[PDB]
Amino acid sequence: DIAGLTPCSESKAFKRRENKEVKSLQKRMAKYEEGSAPALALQATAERTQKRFEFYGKSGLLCGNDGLPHLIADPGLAFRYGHAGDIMIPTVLFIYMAGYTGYAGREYLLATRGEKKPTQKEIIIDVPLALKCVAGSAGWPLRAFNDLRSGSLLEKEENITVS
Amino acid sequence: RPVWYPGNSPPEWLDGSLPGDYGYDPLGLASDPEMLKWWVQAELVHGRWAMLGTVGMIVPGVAARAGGDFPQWYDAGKVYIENSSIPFGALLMTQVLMMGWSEMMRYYEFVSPGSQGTGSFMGFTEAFAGTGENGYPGGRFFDPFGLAKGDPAKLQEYKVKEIKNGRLAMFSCLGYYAQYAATGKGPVDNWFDHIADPFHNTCATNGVSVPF
Amino acid sequence: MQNLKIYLSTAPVIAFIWLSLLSSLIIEVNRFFPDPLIFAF
Amino acid sequence: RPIWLPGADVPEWLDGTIPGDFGYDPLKLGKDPETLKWYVQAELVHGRFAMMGLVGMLVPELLTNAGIGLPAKGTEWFNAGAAPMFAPTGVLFAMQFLLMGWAEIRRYQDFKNPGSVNVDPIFGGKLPDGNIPGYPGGIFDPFGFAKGDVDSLKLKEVKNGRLAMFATLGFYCQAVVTGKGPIACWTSHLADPWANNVWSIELAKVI
Amino acid sequence: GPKRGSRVKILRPESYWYNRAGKVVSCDQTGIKYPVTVRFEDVNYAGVSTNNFGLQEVEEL
Numbered sequence: 088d089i090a091g092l093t094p095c096s097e098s099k100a101f102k103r104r105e106n107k108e109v110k111s112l113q114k115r116m117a118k119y120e121e122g123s124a125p126a127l128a129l130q131a132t133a134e135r136t137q138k139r140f141e142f143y144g145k146s147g148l149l150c151g152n153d154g155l156p157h158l159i160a161d162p163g164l165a166f167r168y169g170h171a172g173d174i175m176i177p178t179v180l181f182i183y184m185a186g187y188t189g190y191a192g193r194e195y196l197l198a199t200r201g202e203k204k205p206t207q208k209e210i211i212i213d214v215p216l217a218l219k220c221v222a223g224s225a226g227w228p229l230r231a232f233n234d235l236r237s238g239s240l241l242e243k244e245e246n247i248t249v250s
Numbered sequence: 251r252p253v254w255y256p257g258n259s260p261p262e263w264l265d266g267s268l269p270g271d272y273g274y275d276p277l278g279l280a281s282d283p284e285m286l287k288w289w290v291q292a293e294l295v296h297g298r299w300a301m302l303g304t305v306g307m308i309v310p311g312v313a314a315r316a317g318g319d320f321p322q323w324y325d326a327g328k329v330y331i332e333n334s335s336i337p338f339g340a341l342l343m344t345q346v347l348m349m350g351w352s353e354m355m356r357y358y359e360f361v362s363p364g365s366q367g368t369g370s371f372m373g374f375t376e377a378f379a380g381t382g383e384n385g386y387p388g389g390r391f392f393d394p395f396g397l398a399k400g401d402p403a404k405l406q407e408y409k410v411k412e413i414k415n416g417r418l419a420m421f422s423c424l425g426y427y428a429q430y431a432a433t434g435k436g437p438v439d440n441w442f443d444h445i446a447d448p449f450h451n452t453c454a455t456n457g458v459s460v461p462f
Numbered sequence: 463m464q465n466l467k468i469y470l471s472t473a474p475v476i477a478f479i480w481l482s483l484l485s486s487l488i489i490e491v492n493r494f495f496p497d498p499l500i501f502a503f
Numbered sequence: 504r505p506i507w508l509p510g511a512d513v514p515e516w517l518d519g520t521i522p523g524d525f526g527y528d529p530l531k532l533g534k535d536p537e538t539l540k541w542y543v544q545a546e547l548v549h550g551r552f553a554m555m556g557l558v559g560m561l562v563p564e565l566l567t568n569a570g571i572g573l574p575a576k577g578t579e580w581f582n583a584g585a586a587p588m589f590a591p592t593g594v595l596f597a598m599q600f601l602l603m604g605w606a607e608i609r610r611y612q613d614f615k616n617p618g619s620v621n622v623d624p625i626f627g628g629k630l631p632d633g634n635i636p637g638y639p640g641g642i643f644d645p646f647g648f649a650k651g652d653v654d655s656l657k658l659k660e661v662k663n664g665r666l667a668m669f670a671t672l673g674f675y676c677q678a679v680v681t682g683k684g685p686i687a688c689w690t691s692h693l694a695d696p697w698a699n700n701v702w703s704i705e706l707a708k709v710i
Numbered sequence: 711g712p713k714r715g716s717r718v719k720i721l722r723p724e725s726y727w728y729n730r731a732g733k734v735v736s737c738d739q740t741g742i743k744y745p746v747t748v749r750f751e752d753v754n755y756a757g758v759s760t761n762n763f764g765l766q767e768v769e770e771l
């Protein structure tokens with residue numbers, strides 16, 4: 088299909104790749120009589136591993152010749168051809184994960200800025216003031232636009248330069 | 251003042267007026283004045299759940315001597331949902347709903363004592379307003395007999411009884427747990443077992459508390 | 463208790479405590495929801 | 504003044520000025536003024552769609568399931584995705600988009616420049632306006648309310664809008680789970696309240 | 711000219727405080743080349759918190 092790939096469920100080497108692991112695993116657990124937890128621990132992993140195979144085959148990942156599932160970047164490809172969960176969705180997740188801690192770091196420096204000596208306030212955090220920021224940081228996309236358009240996000244031209 | 255461990259002096263920060271203050275803070279966790287009033291409520295709450303828990307354990311136990319088919323406090327959880335008729339999820343999630351309401355209400359009177367009875371919870375002003383102490387709401391609902399209204403000298407004398415009876419209910423309710431995990435039998439069963447053959451039923455003979 | 467808090471508010475303490483809250487959480491998310499390649503579920 | 508929970512804050516940047524204000528903004532989205540202005544309108548537009556929209560879900564399914572009288576074609580509100588007939592979803596959609604976006608850009612460019620969306624020469628004919636900021640009035644209030652109950656009427660719009668928004672979200676999440684219609688989800692609970700609750704099925708049931 | 715305690719912005723090209731606010735600790739009434747003395751909360755690379763400037767450079771805000 089896409090890019091000369093095939094869905095991993097209808098792949099073949101992928102099916103080798105799944106059923107070659109259990110063999111090497113089970114031939115190993117034949118050395119432990121069931122009265123041993125190692126007989127159970129190995130068993131539980133073989134059943135744990137097969138779950139993910141039926142998951143990867145189902146979810147529709149694309150395995151190339153090797154049988155290993157690949158991904159696809161472009162929105163116009165992921166979206167239209169149906170699998171965007173590889174990056175396109177989690178690339179939104181991350182930004183909200185990263186910007187949240189990103190923007191929660193900016194407010195704290197603002198709130199702790201005006202004082203007698205902000206320095207000791209950076210070493211020793213007052214967690215309540217940091218908590219009020221961790222709370223306030225949520226919905227940073229809407230709070231970033233506003234510091235952006237109100238003009239309070241940038242520090243403008245009093246920055247220092249050299250020559 | 252009759253401190254615990256006589257011959258010492260109380261930790262210098264709390265000598266003050268608290269019901270049942272014996273000067274016991276050997277790890278010094280009252281050292282934060284803002285935090286102390288948070289522990290004073292913490293105890294009062296535990297003391298009140300204790301005193302209800304103990305009776306809740308003993309009575310079904312004592313009820314079981316005459317017959318009358320109750321369970322022990324342990325494995326009374328099963329026996330109810332053994333016979334069920336309503337699912338476990340619906341019950342535990344009605345807990346969190348109704349119970350969480352009280353606690354999260356009980357909290358914002360501790361935070362700011364003014365609110366919670368300003369009004370606009372179904373009216374009920376002054377019933378929830380609180381009487382101003384940490385763990386004592388007072389009022390119409392929580393205090394139906396109108397006690398703690400008349401003579402204060404008699405009131406401060408209850409506030410002492412409540413704690414001292416609470417500190418004992420906790421310390422006993424630690425026994426109900428611990429002597430269940432060892433002997434595996436009810437609290438009043440043990441209270442008969444040791445009153446019958448005191449010598450071979452003692453603690454050293456449970457085979458758990460004293461391993462070999 | 464005054465000064466025990468201020469120490470617990472030092473930079474390396476929170477750096478330890480708060481990462482060990484992520485680390486633990488991110489570890490256990492993988493306990494119940496194992497092997498998450500793509501967001502498909 | 505009523506508070507969301509009686510003991511907390513009423514954040515500094517938020518006083519009790521605007522109606523439907525109980526002092527709840529934990530994430531502190533509105534802080535600067537020229538934003539709070541915006542969101543207030545974003546609320547009402549939601550609050551207004553949600554009210555109307557929910558009745559599109561509620562009543563038709565209610566009729567059918569309240570008796571034989573006028574059974575709602577399209578069945579449950581999520582079974583009306585099907586039953587287009589006359590025009591294709593390709594065209595009928597971009598007819599909407601073009602048609603709505605005319606009216607709603609008119610709504611924005613009013614918020615931008617408050618006095619007149621359109622002064623009398625431009626956009627031939629039409630342009631009655633009679634517009635105060637934040638509420639259209641004019642055409643959009645034909646019976647001529649704002650008779651002196653405004654402040655109360657304002658509180659009654661938001662407070663019903665607040666609820667229909669929140670209640671709408673239930674219709675989504677319920678149907679996403681129980682696969683039934685609202686009155687099916689309704690009565691089945693009202694029938695036997697315990698076993699038919701939430702959190703006994705699929706969602707908190709993960710436990 | 712400029713007065714003590716009043717805030718300042720510094721346009722001196724070679725400096726660690728160039729375009730950075732500072733508070734005059736003292737201004738001399740003299741003919742000194744560099745009369746004004748400012749003070750900055752920030753620290754230089756050398757660890758210097760104070761410096762002398764010329765009137766043509768210091769500007770008060």
Ligand code: CLA
Nearest residue numbers: 602605622623624625626627628629630631632641642643
């Ligand atoms: C019987 C139904 C009917 C009705 C109710 C109207 C109503 C109206 N006509 Mg009219 N008209 C009709 C049949 C009708 N017409 C027929 C059969 C013809 C062709 C023979 C015309 C040809 C016509 C012309 C050529 C003109 C009107 C105009 C007007 C408007 C004058 C009002 C005004 O100045 O206030 C202020 C002006 C308003 C428009 C008030 C706004 C009221 C509504 C909400 C506006 C609706 C306009 C419409 C949707 C525009 C899109 C259609 C078009 C672009 C294809 C008024 C809305 C005048 C106008 O500007 O409208 C085109 C005008 O010059 N009429």
Ligand code: CLA
Nearest residue numbers: 188189190191192193194195196209212216217218220221
């Ligand atoms: C939370 C505060 C914060 C914020 C808002 C930023 C923001 C920025 N940094 Mg940055 N940085 C920070 C802390 C922060 N940094 C720290 C603590 C260090 C190292 C001691 C660095 C080291 C650093 C370098 C070396 C570079 C940046 C760059 C950048 C810019 C591009 C973003 C990027 O890719 O960074 C990527 C971030 C990293 C590589 C390291 C960040 C590690 C984390 C985020 C620091 C921990 C944050 C802190 C614990 C939050 C406490 C919150 C609590 C007090 C409430 C952006 C302006 C880049 C730049 O200027 O490009 C324009 C760049 O080259 N920063």
Ligand SMILES: CC(/C=C/C=C(C)/C=C/[C@@]12O[C@]1(C)C[C@@H](O)CC2(C)C)=C\C=C\C=C(C)\C=C\C=C(C)\C=C\[C@@]12O[C@]1(C)C[C@@H](O)CC2(C)C
Nearest residue numbers: 275276277278296299300303306323324326420421423424
């Ligand atoms: C609340 C409580 C008990 C509550 C009982 C309940 C709800 C009853 C529950 C049940 O009825 C149900 C629900 C179902 C029934 O079928 C079964 C059960 C399960 C039985 C015990 C508290 C029990 C709490 C106890 C025992 C605490 C002891 C703490 C001590 C001694 C601390 C001392 C210090 O803290 C100080 C004082 C000062 C510091 O400086 C020094 C140190 C040492 C740190």
Ligand SMILES: CC(/C=C/C=C(C)/C=C/[C@@]12O[C@]1(C)C[C@@H](O)CC2(C)C)=C\C=C\C=C(C)\C=C\C=C(C)\C=C\[C@@]12O[C@]1(C)C[C@@H](O)CC2(C)C
Nearest residue numbers: 528529530531532549552553556559560580583668671672
């Ligand atoms: C508008 C809306 C729903 C509209 C639904 C419509 C039109 C339905 C249309 C249909 O049914 C019909 C008509 C017919 C069907 O055949 C077709 C469909 C299409 C199915 C929901 C809004 C839903 C909006 C919701 C649920 C918002 C909830 C917000 C909450 C809880 C709080 C938010 C906060 O902002 C505050 C208050 C303070 C901040 O600090 C903190 C945060 C959290 C940011």
Ligand SMILES: CCCCCCCS[C@@H]1O[C@H](CO)[C@@H](O)[C@H](O)[C@H]1O
Nearest residue numbers: 211212213214215464467468470471
């Ligand atoms: C309890 C685990 C988290 C550790 C931090 C909790 C205390 S928070 C701590 O409170 C102190 C009160 O004097 C302040 O001095 C200090 O600045 C503040 O960080």
